[PDB]
Amino acid sequence: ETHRRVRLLKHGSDKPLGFYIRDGTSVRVTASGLEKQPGIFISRLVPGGLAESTGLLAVNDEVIEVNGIEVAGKTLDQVTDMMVANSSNLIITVKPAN
Amino acid sequence: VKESLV
Hints:
Chain A is α+β, with helices and mostly antiparallel strands. Chain A has one domain (1-98): PDZ domain (Pdz3 Domain). Helices cover 15% and strands 42% of the residues of chain A. Chain A has helices at 50-54, 76-85, and strands at 4-9, 19-28, 35-45, 62-66, 69-70, 89-95. In chain A, strands 1, 2, 3, 4, 5 and 6 form a 6-stranded antiparallel sheet that branches. The two termini of chain A are 15 Å apart. Chain B is mainly β. The termini of chain B are far apart. Chain B is 0% helix and 50% strand. At the A-B interface, strand 2 and helix 2 of A face strand 1 of B. Strand 2 (19-28) of chain A pairs antiparallel with strand 1 (3-5) of chain B, so a sheet runs across the interface. Chain A: Residues 5-98 form the PDZ domain.
């Protein structure tokens, strides 16, 4: 599988995970062939932030699931809420851009 | 682009 699971071990309750997400499009494979579908992607990393420090997350990476739950069919607002809830010990499944 | 910080 091309998917990669990243665990962000945060300590500061106020300090953010260190990244931004945006709406995007993903041309995933299907039966009839490649097809476009909505998706969530990392737009950028906070300088000096936790996410950047790990070196496991990068811009354009696609968020597939948050702590075991797929983000497919959800809005940017809903996915954002899903992540801040697991800030303490967040596990994110992504699909590397590069 | 609209982005959301986490």
